[model samples]
Every structure is written in C-alpha cells, then in structure tokens.
Target: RAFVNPFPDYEALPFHQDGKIIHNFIRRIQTKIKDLLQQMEEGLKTADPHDCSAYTGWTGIALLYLQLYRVTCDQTYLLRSLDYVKRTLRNLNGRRVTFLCGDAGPLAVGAVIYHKLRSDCESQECVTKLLQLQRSVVCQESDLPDELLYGRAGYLYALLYLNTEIGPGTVCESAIKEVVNAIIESGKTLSREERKTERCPLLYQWHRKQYVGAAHGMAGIYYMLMQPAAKVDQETLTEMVKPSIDYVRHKKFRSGNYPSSLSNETDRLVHWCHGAPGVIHMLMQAYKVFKEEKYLKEAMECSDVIWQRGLLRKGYGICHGTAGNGYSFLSLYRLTQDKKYLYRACKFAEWCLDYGAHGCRIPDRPYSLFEGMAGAIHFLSDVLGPETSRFPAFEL
Candidate 1:
C-alpha cells in the first residue's frame, strides 16, 4: 500500500581518484566549439534541422554560441549566434516544451530570451506567443509534474527568466502568480494515494512515478519553487518541497548516488538531466535554503561518485553528456570551495573534449543547447568564464 526507498543499495561501481585529467582545458574546448560551429553552419545552409526548442533546436544554439562569444569575446561567434536566434524566432512564432520534440513557441522562448540577452531586436509577437503557452499550462489540468525539462516548472522558470532579463513587468504578474500558486497547490493537495508510490513522494501524481532526477523531477521543481519570482516561503518548503527532498535524501544507494528514475536498479544513471548530477544540484539548493548538513552531505556523497566512475555516456551536451554531468560537480565546487570538485568538473569536460568532441551520437542530431554540441559548448564556457551570470539556463 505504501512505498519505501525502491533502491536501497547502489550497484557496486568502482571509485576513481586518479589525477589523470587536467584543468587547463579552455584552449581545447574553444577549438572544439569552433569546429561544431562550422558543422552547424554548414548543416543550416542547406535546410532547416527543424526543431527549435533550446534543447534540440536553434534556441539552444543561439544561447550556446552567444555565450561562446562572451567566453572567447569573439564577435563573430556572437554575430552568428544572434543570427541563429533571429532565424529560430521567425520559425517559431508558435511552439512549446516537453524538451525533445521542438515546437516553435518553446523554441521561441529561448530565442526571445537570447534576443533579450544579446541586447537587441525585441520581438513582441514572440513574447506574446510564449504567454499564450503560459496560458495553456494554466488552463490544463493535466498530470504534469513541476519539471524544468518540459513541464510546469519549465514554463515557470523560462517566464521568470524572461521577466528578469526583459525587466520587471514584462510578463503579467497575475500569470506568474497563477503558475506559482498552482504548483504549490498541487504539492499540498496531491494525496499520498495520489502520489507515485515508487517515485518521488510528494511531486508526482497518482499512480505515476517517472524520472526521479532533475530534468524531470525534484531538482527542476525545487529550483523553480525556490526562485524569488515564485515567492515560495518556509511553509511551502515544509508542506510541499521537503518531502520530495526527504525521499531522495533517504533513498540513496550505499554509494550515495541517486538513480535516473524509479523503474529499477537498471534505472541507475549518472548524467545531469536524469541522474546524480541533477539530483545533487537540487540537494545543494535544499542545503542552502534549509542550512541542513544532511542535504549538503548527500550532495557531496553524490558528487563524489563521478570522480570514481568518470564519464561513460557518449554525448558531451547538457542533456546526457559529460558537460551536463560536470555542471553538478561545478556546483559542488561552488558550494564547498573545494578544488577537488572543481577538478572533478574539469575532468568531465576534459573527457568530453578528449573523446566525445564531435557532439551527439544520435543520427542527424541537433546542435541545440540541450542535447547537442551547443549545450556542450555552453557547459564548457561556464567552466571557464566568470561571466556566467548571463547563461540564460534560467534555472539557477
């Protein structure tokens, strides 16, 4: 009738602490992104790769290359990325997110956000399109969890990102509140019987248990709720968010790693979107907000797993690759001021540059920022730049 931690023990993967990976990787990353830009440019000239969502389309490319420009200060990359944004905007006057299948509006949101970030050519029509998407999320009573990948939280964070970058009063205050209120209400109202017994305790709906990690689970939702825009308070944290964190907190493998989802031990994964990296990012936030040593402890235990196993996945993008996975370690470094975590992050990038540099392993894959080369580029740029405040990932 009830659920306990489905995974009580992590599969015995080996731990690694060898000092083989290097830190001075900026030079290699720069060269690699430059190569990707050429591939993207050549591919774009003949026909549309079609998907425009930042994850699998031009929106991500626009943001990724734009940041590349910032990192290298090469105006050419900036100009080219700006062009990708405009091109994506024109294509996506109407679209939306669950992430992979690129609809135009969701694509346009990132496009428009990048437009604003680059400081030129604001298109009201694109902005209007996204608000309607916001309206749709409000209108629907679907079973979507609050996730950043393609659910309510994604809409919430992007709009917040829009509001922040485009300045206050850009998005309707009423709309922002509605989404925020809905998320809180869902968290508070969804009964334990209605919850995913084997999934996150508080976040998922009745008989539903999917991914237990960030791209679609606790981290993305928690990140959105914690945002200043959502106006989340201590009450909601205890009533709404804390239980999910508590579930994740207690459900760890003996190795201290979180799995990709709740399917089985087969669900064990270590990438950013679906595994320990994303979960740790979520945990670090909980640790910060609650000042709990336990949350921080969980985060370190999770972050520590990567150093031992190293990179095993193929792509170097933000969705499933080393770059996305590396970001969590970067966050660990940020939290602990520990260079070992910093080196851990650097090592993932080094692994990508050394091995997965050609980008996505998927056939005719995207250059989008989420699952493709652009995300890899963006992730690498963040590692090297102090100017990362403009990353436009919109999550934190």
Candidate 2:
C-alpha cells in the first residue's frame, strides 16, 4: 500500500511558469480555496473520534479557513476557524499542549489568533487555554527548540499586537519575555565553535554533540528585537545577523546557490527552503533597523537564490527542503516592488490554495497549529497586504 500522511492533498493545482505578472490566476485560486474550505468544514462535522485528525481540523482547516475569510471576505471561513478552535479546546480537556516533536508552533499560532479575533468571552477562554499551553508545552528533550522558540515567539508578538488593541492584560507579556530570555540562554551553553558552525541554531545532537547554531542564531536575535522593550543594540543584533550571511557568502555552490543546512560535522552541504527564509527574514528586519540599502541588497541576493534554484516550479505549492521559498518570496515582495515578487507570491499562494483544495497531507497525527498558521499567514499577508504582513505573528 502507498504511504498515506494525515494532512490534506496539495497537488493538482495550476503552476505558474512566469513570475512576472500578478494575474487573474489569483481569482481562480481564491474560488478554489472557497470550495475546498467548504468541503473541509463538512468533513469536520463527522470526522471519526479515534482519527479526530484534530491537527488538520484545528490548525490546517481552521487557520486556512480564517485566511480564506480575510483574503476573500467570507464570513464562513472565519466562523469555521472559530468553531474549530473551540472544539479543539474542548477536546484538550485541560491537557497541556506538548511540543516534543516540533508540533507546538502551530498550536501557539492558532491560540494566539483565536484569542485575537474571537468575541470577548471566547477570547478570554482562548487566551486562557493559550497561557496554559505555553506554561506546559515541551519540545524535543527540553522546553526549548529553535523551531518551538521561534514559533512561540511569533505567537507572542501576535499577542503583543492583540494586547495593544484590546488591553495590556490580554497576554502575559512578562511570561513571553521570560521564555524568550530562556531561549537566548539556551544558546549560551554552546561553545564559540558551535555558535560559529551555523547562525540559526536549530539542530541539536550530532554524536553525543548538541548542535544549536544555525537557524536559532538568526531566530533568537529576531525574537529579541520583537520584544516590546527590546533594547538590543544595533551592533549586537548586527553581529548575530552578519555571520550567517558571511558564512553563506563563502559556502555558495558553483551554481551560485546557497545550501540551507550548515553542518558542524563536515563541509557537507544540503540546501533547503528553511535557510533562505531565515536569510530573507533577517534582512527584512535589518533594512528597517538600519535604513540601509545594503541590507536590501542582501535581501535581493537571498531572493535571487529562490528563483535560481527553481524552487518555485509550477504546481509545487512551495517545496520544502532548502531555502524556505515561500518565505523568501514573501520577504522579496515587501522589500522590492518589482512586481515579480508579488506575482511569484501570488502564484505560490494560488498553488497552496489549490493544494488545500485537493487535500494535501501534512505530517504528524494532526495538523500543526503553527504550521498551518505559518503557511496561511504567508498566503494571507501576501494577498491581503501590509495590514497582515506588518504583524509579528507571521514573522517566524
């Protein structure tokens, strides 16, 4: 039998060959998202108890539902997401959410948004659940992981925004600060060699050796900047940000492309979408922080890799592996008004929209709250505009 994953289908979508025009393909894709979301809603009404597919029901379906609502102004999508969040909370039955396997990010994303968008009573309940989840969530062997930290930090930034609009009491700002600080401290355990291995710090353990260098480096620095009172010196942030760029500058393959994975074990290089996303994300913040064109220039270089890799092949919603293509494109769209980035973003968004329509499967027993939110937020921000992209929830 063929291997079957627990998420929705993501193929069967039209692929855009040219990344030059923001065309009518978007409207067609929007219509398809509407239909797919409707089917997901109907499917959720009677999903099996044992195979609750809670992740998909709550994270994938719910998050996309909200995106569809925002992008298309369809109340159905919003209401569906609200309903799923409520149902998922009820299912939790006071259990703490766990992140031992990198699943916590999506839950954090969902909880943050649900609290932000729901009614007063609903918001109170959702926020309470979120606090509980944050208090108890675990990742890998510890409470800290670059994936989990960045995911939660992204959620906390969202919380900061919601607190601003609603009130200060909406989220435990101190708790978020503490957690982020803890994340930073986690990196302190590394030797200088480890720190210099890679700038992000996502990998842990390579033979009784823990790796916390690459993605975590960029993510940790970015999280610090997201703090409300982040008094991070520009120089300190620059120090953290520049190493990855410096490392990649010399590590480029003969093909003029950079690899995503930076191994401490050896010089073996495996490029993926994850690294480029970090590069683009960091550069976007750098441009705003320094008001320097060099940062923008660097961001453009990062964007160029996305195109050169053919990572955005037609029908590939946004392939994973190296460079975080969708994310890189998102950064490009914001940094440059070349229309190419926007067109590319639109094309990728359409591909994902269609993928959701056809039911592409995500890993894990259920859909990830953080994963769905990340994917949907990327799509919504790209399609909807600054109102969405300006927020921190979508940053990581």
Point out where model 1 deviates above 4 Å: 1-25, 43-48, 72-75, 90-121, 143-145, 195-201, 205-207, 356-366, 386-394
For candidate 2, write residues 23-92 as lDDT tens digits: 4554564565455445544544554443212233344455555555655576755666666545444444
lDDT of 1 by residue, 281-392 (tens): 7788888787879889888888767555435545666766666767776677667765566666665665666544333365245455766666666766666642242324
By summed lDDT, which 10 consecutive residues of candidate 1 come out lowest? 1-10
CA lDDT of 262 in candidate 1?
Answer: 55
Candidate 1 clashes: the total is 5
Reference-based TM-score of each model: 0.80, 0.65
Candidate 1 global TM-score? 0.80
Every candidate's lDDT: 0.61, 0.43
